[PDB]
Design a binder for this molecule. Sequence first.
Ligand SMILES: *OP(=O)(O)OC[C@H]1O[C@@H](n2cnc3c(N)ncnc32)[C@H](O)[C@@H]1O
Lengths: 253, 249, 248, 640
Amino acid sequence: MFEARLVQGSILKKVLEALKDLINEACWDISSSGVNLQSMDSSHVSLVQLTLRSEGFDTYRCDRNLAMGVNLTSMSKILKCAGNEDIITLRAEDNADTLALVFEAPNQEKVSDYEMKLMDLDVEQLGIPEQEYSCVVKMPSGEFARICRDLSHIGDAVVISCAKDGVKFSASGELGNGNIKLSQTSNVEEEAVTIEMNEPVQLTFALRYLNFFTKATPLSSTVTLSMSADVPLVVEYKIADMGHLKYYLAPKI
Amino acid sequence: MFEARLVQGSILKKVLEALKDLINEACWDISSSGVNLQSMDSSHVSLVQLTLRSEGFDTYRCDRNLAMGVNLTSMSKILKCAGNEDIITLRAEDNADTLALVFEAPEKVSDYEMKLMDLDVEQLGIPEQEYSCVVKMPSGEFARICRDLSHIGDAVVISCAKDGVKFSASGELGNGNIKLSQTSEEEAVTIEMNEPVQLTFALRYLNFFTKATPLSSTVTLSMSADVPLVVEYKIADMGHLKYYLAPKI
Amino acid sequence: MFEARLVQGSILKKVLEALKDLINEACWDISSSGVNLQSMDSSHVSLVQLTLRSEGFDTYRCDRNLAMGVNLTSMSKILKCAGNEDIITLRAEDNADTLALVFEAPEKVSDYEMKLMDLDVEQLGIPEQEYSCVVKMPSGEFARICRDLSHIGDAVVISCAKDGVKFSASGELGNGNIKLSQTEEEAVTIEMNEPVQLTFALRYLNFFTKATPLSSTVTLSMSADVPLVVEYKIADMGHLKYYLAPKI
Amino acid sequence: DPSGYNPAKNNYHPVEDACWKPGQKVPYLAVARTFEKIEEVSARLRMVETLSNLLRSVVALSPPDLLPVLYLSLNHLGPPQQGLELGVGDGVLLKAVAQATGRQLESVRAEAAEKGDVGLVAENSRSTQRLMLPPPPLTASGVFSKFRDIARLTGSASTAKKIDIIKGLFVACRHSEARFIARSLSGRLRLGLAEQSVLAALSQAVSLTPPGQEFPPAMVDAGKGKTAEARKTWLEEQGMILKQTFCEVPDLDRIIPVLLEHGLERLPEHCKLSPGIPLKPMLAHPTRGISEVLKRFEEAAFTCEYKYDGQRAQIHALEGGEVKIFSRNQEDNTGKYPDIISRIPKIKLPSVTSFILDTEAVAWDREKKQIQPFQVLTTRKRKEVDASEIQVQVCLYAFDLIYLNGESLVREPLSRRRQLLRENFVETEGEFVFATSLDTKDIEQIAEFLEQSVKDSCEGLMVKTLDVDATYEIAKRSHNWLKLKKDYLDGVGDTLDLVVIGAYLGRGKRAGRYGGFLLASYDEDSEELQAICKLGTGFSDEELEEHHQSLKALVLPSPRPYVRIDGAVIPDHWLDPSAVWEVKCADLSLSPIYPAARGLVDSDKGISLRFPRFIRVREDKQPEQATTSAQVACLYRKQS
DNA sequence: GCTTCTGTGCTGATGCGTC
DNA sequence: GTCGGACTGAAC
DNA sequence: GTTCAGTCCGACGACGCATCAGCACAGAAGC
Ligand SMILES: *OP(=O)(O)OC[C@H]1O[C@@H](n2cnc3c(N)ncnc32)[C@H](O)[C@@H]1O
């Protein structure tokens, strides 16, 4: 008997559209504290973590903890039929095979109701406690997006070299190679680059997933990356007064 | 020789784009009443009516009633040439197998001759009848409703009650529905109800109809038992488009 | 060596945008006068020339007259990485197959190195001509009329007299025309020596028009039996011309 | 009312037993009823009688409607050389049916699968989307005109325009026309009657009720007062006349108007063979070896030649200076070989103004001066005539001469035709040659020639009469020459034993049952089954039922992990791998669709069997003991 | 900024013509 | 391309 | 005169060029 009321439904739009291509399906945990998910990707190389904090809902009613199996492409089509300024309600019967989605216009005139069939999934989850990562960066989202959109043409992989003065990204390919440097910056908070870092890292990753990771960009004008030796890179977007989204990508070679 | 002129040639562009995807060939009847089209679809499921009232034109002059067949493809590729600010002349010589147009910008003039075609006319005289529901609503919201419904299901059940209209459909995902209420002008919802009615329609056709949205910000839907649905757009002091959609079951 | 700076790097972005679809592979010829290129298309119907005056550069050092073979499509793929606001540095070695681009925005630096190639280049000497009709007209008008006429028929007849130019298309759909009459950057002007009529195939002009965002005005040069000249006046920097052989 | 139309009545009458007004456009319902009667009958003669009955009425009532009725019966849209194609497959038409029924796709997909016929699903379900005008009756002229419209509307979004026209046809259906239209579109019309039988029906009709008579015609039965035997002798002599008259000009658009206007006896006086009009190629029977050759040719002189493993090419040279080429099937190959257009003046003698040649074209290794396999030939670009950048060099190999300078040569003994062929042409090694030819009647001589043929990359030997029954005419017999293929002339070819892991449900004769099977090789070094081929041929009907019942219980809901498949189409059921089948093949080819032997010859291009023929189940072996990837690689290396 | 669109391919998916 | 299958004539 | 003999008709297969579709994004235009 769950209910979520959210005023800013474009949040849910923007988070959901970041998975519809990555994974055709997912499972959603509901609990008194909020909504959570961890999923493996379809080629089983990278991991996605999702947290929507219950505090951010305009109204809440978690009468039980639930784990809905959901086809993300279908839900994506459905919310491609949802209005931006619309005020969103999710209702789930405990005993049903359905999630009710209901939407109310700001003009009070237009009432939408849709219901989506549920199903079971063979959930694989992996335990990932926090680590005191050797590098942390915050930097402008549109910048990193532009960098990935550039360098994926040059070559299939990037090498990232960080030092305390700044980071350099290298890509190499058939026409040649390219090195982009960024320095730390101050006195622009929102447009600045911040580095907290413990040792100069140099690591390699496949850009065919980085161009996927960038697809959240409208969620938060800043992004954080974190690096450590012989471990996945973490990429995180801070969901405005609502939650977070994280990608974990394992190192190449 | 027939000649007509309009300052708002944007109307003509919008009109043909509202016709494009529904039919490829039609014969246009011109009278002292103005320009009028009947055409059934090549699937024989739905029909268009055109009205342009002759007094709506800035300039208009006719010798004779003409029935000219035109391929809608090529002639729309021609109408793409007009800027949104252009003054259109349509001219037809009575025995011509080509149609003459001029586009006039507000030192540059565009001139065109398009070949006509000869067509085996199919026309149905619609009887005037009252309909158990009439609804006056904004075009833009109807557009969202129809485009939305396109993903979820292929056929629509339309239900009317005095409390407000309801659109429902389903597919290999589940069910979708909208209940839309009245207001209390160009943004308004209003109804001319007679009895609570339910009918079925094919959404692919309504998605074809919706393309006329830029013609008028508000529209009439007119609905009755055992008869085609009427969608009508009144182009401002110029005329109207009517669309007749046969029902399911 | 070679060492250049340009502030208005968007010019070079638009330049390489213009060429990439028409000619795939080319030669960059470098001088104290600046950057120059002539090349012939893959159908060998049309010739392009770029002239960039060295004085227009924000900084410019040319030590020798280079001739560098470049894949234009790949060059354009690189140039897509800079924002139009970026200041650009070009750097060349003498023996190297490799050319350095340094991009800088108004706090970021892009370093890019492009490998060269060994090429057969075909040269045409072009002595002076004076063209009988010279049309100076606003560029977008030409571009839109080209994109229009592309549907009416794959060929055009162009006409000039001192009182106006007319462009006629012809095909099974129908025939059509645009008249133009002589009338700041909104004006059309003509110098006419002899009234002209010429026949052309549109596919190439469709390609030429992609240079349009380089210049507010385009100039048409017409004379008997010669290729049509279409010219994009880059502001103070030089010029860009296309020669197209008239039909049959 | 055509719903009562019965052409299968005894004492059939041309106008009395008809179902529409004189001068009227023929109701398509009648043609569908006739196809219904044709499906009801297994007797070919009785079918040809019933079709001739309809044809006789058509030429009696509505003469212009004839040609559409023939092309409907031929399942064709015009002259084959005009290049017309309907271009609509199973998926597009299936969607058209689902939309016309208003159903979702998957139920009707499985339904059409289970009955293995689009016909019976085309009726039944209905949209209930009640039209405001009930449609006019269908006419056979209108329906054919819609089929050529369907063929003509190409371009972006063209599938919409197809779906709309086909819709109108479906919703317009009346009694049971849907089944025949659906089968007519999908190519599989399954009417059980073809070209030779329709021309027989034409000859029979046009004989009994000839054209040009004023309505009502006073004569109806040319056979009246003749004995049934001498009736048949008159029918059959007009048969050979018309069939040869068809084979010299394989096109109804040329034949029919002149036939209607002048009468079948004067027909040849207006029709003669000429370049710029194609002809049917020559056919051959299969034979197993020398004994049957010696017996079939026991009183006729013959010769032996290679079967080069290329493709046929029909060469037309006109005195006007263009040349045309046609394929084996009258498809218009000009555009494929603009280089061969350029080679013509260096191949002919200049003393010859025009010719028609039958020739094989084969890809050639210009530096190695040798042939390459047919998987190099099939790599040519199709439509455009850019001779400039030729990636695949080609050589021509002559074997017969048809026409020269103005004289047609088809009536002529092969000896003279080959004599004139050699005497009026020049060769150029690796560009144009005559086929290697050897004249003999004796056994070990042929054995030596065969051994040279197989080691010189040829499919076998060609055996042809020199003079007795050595004229070209297809009407007497189509298959006059013989092929001596390695396949059984070796006694046994490349036979393998492979593992069945899946089935395809069949259609038509194969309907309800399995129609094809999926085979894999045992890759021991992974211990996995890798897909190698499908099978669809060489087994009889009783043993078909034996395989089906044996397989039916062993179906699985999933593919097993010990099975490798990729690019090969998903089986209609998954089958437990317990059965091993013995099969022969013609050749081995590098496959982009088959995972077997991947990396044993090349890392990415797999391998597969050309022309697999079933033999027998090898039920004594276990699957893991069947052919393994090692022998597969050895066999292909041993091919080269 | 966002809109809906339009023109943009890029890469996939069968129809059809050979053996 | 190829093999089987139902049917009218073949000729010993 | 019937155990053969040849016709004829449709079952199915393996490749591959063409050839179009189906998201999906930059792009520009309109707001
Ligand atoms: O195997 P099949 O029945 O398709 O054979 C007929 C084809 O064989 C080709 N071919 C090759 N060489 C010859 C010769 N010398 N004579 C006749 N045909 C030949 C042809 O492509 C033919 O259609």
